[PDB]
Swiss-Prot record, chain A:
Ribosomal protein found in the keyword field: no
Keyword Membrane: yes
GO MF terms, alphabetically ordered: actin binding; fructose-bisphosphate aldolase activity
Reactions that this protein is recorded to catalyse: beta-D-fructose 1,6-bisphosphate = D-glyceraldehyde 3-phosphate + dihydroxyacetone phosphate
Subunit text: Homotetramer. Interacts with TRAP (via cytoplasmic domain); the interaction prevents substrate binding and thereby inhibits aldolase activity. Interacts with MTRAP (via cytoplasmic domain); MTRAP phosphorylation may increase the binding to FBPA. Interact with RH1 (via cytoplasmic domain). Interacts with RH2b (via cytoplasmic domain). Interacts with RH4 (via cytoplasmic domain). Interacts with AMA1 (via cytoplasmic domain); the interaction is weak, however it may be increased upon AMA1 phosphorylation. Interacts with EBA140 (via cytoplasmic domain); the interaction is weak.
Species, as recorded: Plasmodium falciparum
Coiled-coil segments: none
Name of the featured protein: Fructose-bisphosphate aldolase
Binding locations of beta-D-fructose 1,6-bisphosphate: 46, 276-278, 304, 307
Curated annotation (Swiss-Prot), chain D:
Reaction catalysed by this enzyme: beta-D-fructose 1,6-bisphosphate = D-glyceraldehyde 3-phosphate + dihydroxyacetone phosphate
InterPro entries for the chain: Aldolase_I_AS, Aldolase_TIM, FBA_I
Activity control note: The cytoplasmic tail of TRAP and probably other adhesins acts as a competitive inhibitor as the binding sites of the glycolytic substrate fructose 1,6-bisphosphate and TRAP partially overlap.
UniProt main location, coarse: cytoplasm
Consequence the record notes for mutating residue 310 to S: Severe reduction in the binding to TRAP
Domain of life assignment: Eukaryota
Protein name (Swiss-Prot/TrEMBL): Fructose-bisphosphate aldolase
GO MF, one annotated term: fructose-bisphosphate aldolase activity
Effect of residue 37 to G: Reduces binding to TRAP
Effect of residue 149 to D: Severe reduction in the binding to TRAP
Coiled-coil regions listed in the entry: none
SUPFAM superfamilies registered for this protein in UniProt: Aldolase (SSF51569)
Length: 349, 358, 363, 351
């Protein structure tokens, strides 16, 4: 008869079930996510890193290059798209989404509207996007998108008490509100509280901060009634700071990352999809491999890489359309490299 | 360095301006005029006076309100919808200048309305944080010196409403809004309206309002909001609309003052009450009852719209003929509530029947 | 000092963290669980009256000797929770009771809470006492041989009165968190026990909702107080319908909704969950624990911390008699093994599987 | 007609009313509280500075000296006692509490059981005493006690992040629990979250930490259902740290203290009763005066002083039965000095 009222109420069976199946498919054994959700601005920085200007024709051709790759769906379960790309066609008539449906890859969509400063903090970041989010999700689901992405940024600066409480909770609560809005509108939310590697902090300090942040994130999720079974976490790997602290090894990066997750992420969460940050394409693969070499986990420990999958793909494409067959060969190589890291079976040489 | 885990302070310059504006907004004997009705909301008002909801009529009506000579004596500020803040009257003069001429501070509604919180039974979240900082910069240039953001909570005891999710979404939303405002030089009116809907007793409303406000002010300190440059716009503590045990104004006054004294710190310059579904007389009589209870640690004044405008429209009918007669009615109500600020409004129980002898 | 992140709990010394973790692992060993023998003088007097026997120090010592003196009991039991008296007690022939456990390889534990009191401004909701002098008692209990502790808190589900209230949930959450961090500092693995009572007519789904909310809150308090999950254990109620509800709930639901709730709230750094049998029968406690483990392999050990569910029938077949000791120790081993098999999801002894079934006509 | 369930329930009208009257009396106009709640542990040290043996006879004689002062009730509304003193009689057969009743002073009782380390913090302190507290209160009320005191300690060290969140909440939640138990058992709780002045931090930093701590303390109080009308706060004044050697004049001590309270303490709280910390007898009076010279406040801003009232009373006594009269004059002098500080009218200026 009477429910315990002071508790978030359940997702209707139908959507809860769909969210859970999408989430499981997204972390299928041997697969991960391709981050191709670069906005017009963030594409202009990478395109013009290898020359040839940032037009709608070049962007469409580049996303065609990525999503048109045969066999990529064996290593990639989902592709995070920017709004433009989601409704876009190739120079050939076909929806970009259909080429993901061809290769049997799930389309996703970035839904955050970027970062703004939290007042009364030293430039700590709040993520925008809740305004009209529900309505955008309905439109994105119709367009084919089955999962979402929302990025928030925290900073480790121990001297200045960063990340601060205000920063941690603005981030935690923002993600929780986003994630519940997606699930209501039939999209699996990728919850991304990226702690930046910037600074000279040790790996132990990063472990402490990441644990504190994640504990607080999951608390907000529960608060807001988010179904963990139909959600994914996209955290930073636990590493020493860029400015260094006895330049640690992959053995450590793997242990302190697995430990942190085991103390903070409940097993109802189907999987964690790691973000590469500033790591090299190779170290992103070596570190993911070190994480999975530490035995079979309660969740799928896989990847959501952008730069780590695309860097040498761009630099071996250079715009010219003769390289598409050749550029996709570099993509597949990296996709398989990270697929093997999922299994803990990626060595090197 | 200093203690790092606490919000940083506002610059001495803006903190001082916010504090001055907040004080002026709750000046002795003054309150705020809520003329912030959107196009959709003001359309429903013009139906009652069978008038076309056009840009011409809206401009003429706001001209009617802000063009009133002597309105500034009783009104310190006017909340506006975006359109009106940039709008002109039919004779070319910008309506913000009409407020300036009567020395009334212009304000601006910045929330983008309500949406459902998922996993709650239709409990409401207020939208508007996206691009808010930018809108504030634009509104300050336009002349606006304070803002308004409305959130709605509901009391339904059997259904555990307001639920915790509801209270904190509201609390945190208002805290973020207030902090973004103050950064951009606007005094935020923090409005956590608990609806009077339902049959709940006045004691239950007191319990809920106290819990909500305790939670709101926590979010406020959390986000680093300067209480000295902010204002609270709460519901008066009242029994619900369908409560058989019908209460009188003296209780509305007591349980409202109590609730505020247990939750609102005195750094807050003043509370500007919302009318709710109260009639014009009730809104004045109840505000008067609140202030009849001694002098308070903060200014207990009003932010009324319907309670100031209801009869003004009904003695106008859109006709330029009856403008003079509508101003009459606005100044009457404005003065009535100005007197209730002091606790000296009668406006029509010993009342002894005497006789004889010495 | 060095510029590390300062607004978080500081780590335990490497030495004690490691000991706590090994004890916690041993406490949830394969095929093992915990024996709750921590009955107070007042509570043990109630059970001795059901066998028409007197409650003296001699009888209590004899009964605990009966339990801990059982040969081979350590194959099914990893640890035994004791009441302070028993921890510092010798048997008939002057042998310390803790030594009886050492022989049988069982780890001794100790109840450290000082009972329940009402939270003011709630409708008789309960707060657990005991933080005063706790650190000191732990030092004394560790010297006495105790390697883990137990602290019980009680929440009630009454949906109409909004129980458990937020005040109740946090007093319990914070109390347990404080208790945990005091124990771990003093080298004792804390069993964190937020028992949600089965009392009332609530459905299983409502219990799942409340258990999930409570555990989410408990683990938040743990993390804030700096408790090492690797060196701690959780002792929750199984998720079940209220006692006064309808007249059913199938054990497969008790199993599903219990496993689900834990998967959404308990992070895998926690070595194991040790369930309390509450008001279940001895057989039901075994059948339900079996249903939980029949649901594939789990990220933690899902085992038992049973008292009544292990002792009810032993007390019965004993009645204070020196002769029945031999015979009663068989009933103990029977139940201990029954639950050991339930740990593996491999218990039957009464029915088997609630499926298939019938009369096969063969051809 | 059901009430809103997820909120702490009210105290019975009877006890709520009594708590509120006691709280009001405790911060009467021109009055404050005498902290005579020293343990045997701590009064030993004060007796050592006056070369006196710490015996039951001497302790009883000293408390007789304090509470036996004629016309002390004019300047003091309440006296916080140590358990021993509450049940003790003078070398004469007269109950100590009867001496308080004679001057119409309200007896109070210290109920905390001292401090212990919070594990996983750098020696930050948690206050003990919740075990059996309800029962002790019933006993203390029967003995005549009408209000209680519970001391918690936070430290400001900005480099080490103190007070850390764990420390702030353990303190806040402990005080809330203590407060709620007292009120249930008819005792007005003095909520004391002392932020120590130790360190070289500036007055602004102290204001920032005190504000944060008090915001969190009052949050716990609402959570636990504490009736603010029947409670008192005993905070540190906002001051610079002991080191640094900045100015930190009394006008600033007054301003930043008043500001902090106005941003954190709701007016339902009848009054704030300041602790002196390690301030000198005069400094404690001058600073309290500077606070009240900043105009009439929404609550009574008064004192709960021990050392700052007793230091010279003790030293000008030396344990000697002759010096009783003489020391009592020093006490009244100080009591009146701080009573005048209440009104903002102590030593009619210096600027």
């Amino acid at each position: 008869c009477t429910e315990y009222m002071n508790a978030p109420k359940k997702l209707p069976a139908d959507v809860a079930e769909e969210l859970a199946t999408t989430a499981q498919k997204l972390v299928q054994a041997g697969k991960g996510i391709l981050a191709a959700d670069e906005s017009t601005q963030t594409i202009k920085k990478r395109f013009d890193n290898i020359k040839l200007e940032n037009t709608i024709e070049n962007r469409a051709s580049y996303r065609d290059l990525l999503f048109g790759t045969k066999g990529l769906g064996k290593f990639i379960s989902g592709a995070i798209l920017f709004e433009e790309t989601l409704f876009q066609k190739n120079e050939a008539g076909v929806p970009m989404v259909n080429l993901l449906h061809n290769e049997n890859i799930i389309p996703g969509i970035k839904v955050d509207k970027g970062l703004v400063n939290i007042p009364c903090t030293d430039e700590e970041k709040s993520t925008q996007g809740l305004d009209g989010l529900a309505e955008r999700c309905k439109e994105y689901y119709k367009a084919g998108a089955r999962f979402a992405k929302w990025r928030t940024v925290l900073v480790i600066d121990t001297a200045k008490g960063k990340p601060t409480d205000l920063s941690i909770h603005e981030t935690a609560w923002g993600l929780a509100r986003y994630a519940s809005i997606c699930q209501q509108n039939r999209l699996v939310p990728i919850v991304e509280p990226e702690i930046l590697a910037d600074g000279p902090h040790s790996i132990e300090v990063c472990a402490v901060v990441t644990q504190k942040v994640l504990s607080c994130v999951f608390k907000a999720l529960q608060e807001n009634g988010v179904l963990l079974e139909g959600a994914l976490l996209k955290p930073n790997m636990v590493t020493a700071g860029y400015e260094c602290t006895a330049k640690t090894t992959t053995q450590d990066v793997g242990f302190l990352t697995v430990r942190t997750l085991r103390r903070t992420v409940p097993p109802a969460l189907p999987g964690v999809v790691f973000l590469s940050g500033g790591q090299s394409e190779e170290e992103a693969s070596v570190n993911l491999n070190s994480i999975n070499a530490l035995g079979p986990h309660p969740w799928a420990l896989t990847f959501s890489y952008g730069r780590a999958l695309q860097a040498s793909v761009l630099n071996t494409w250079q715009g010219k359309k003769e390289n598409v067959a050749k550029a996709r060969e570099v993509l597949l190589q990296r996709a398989e490299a990270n697929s093997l890291a999922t299994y803990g079976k990626y060595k090197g040489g």
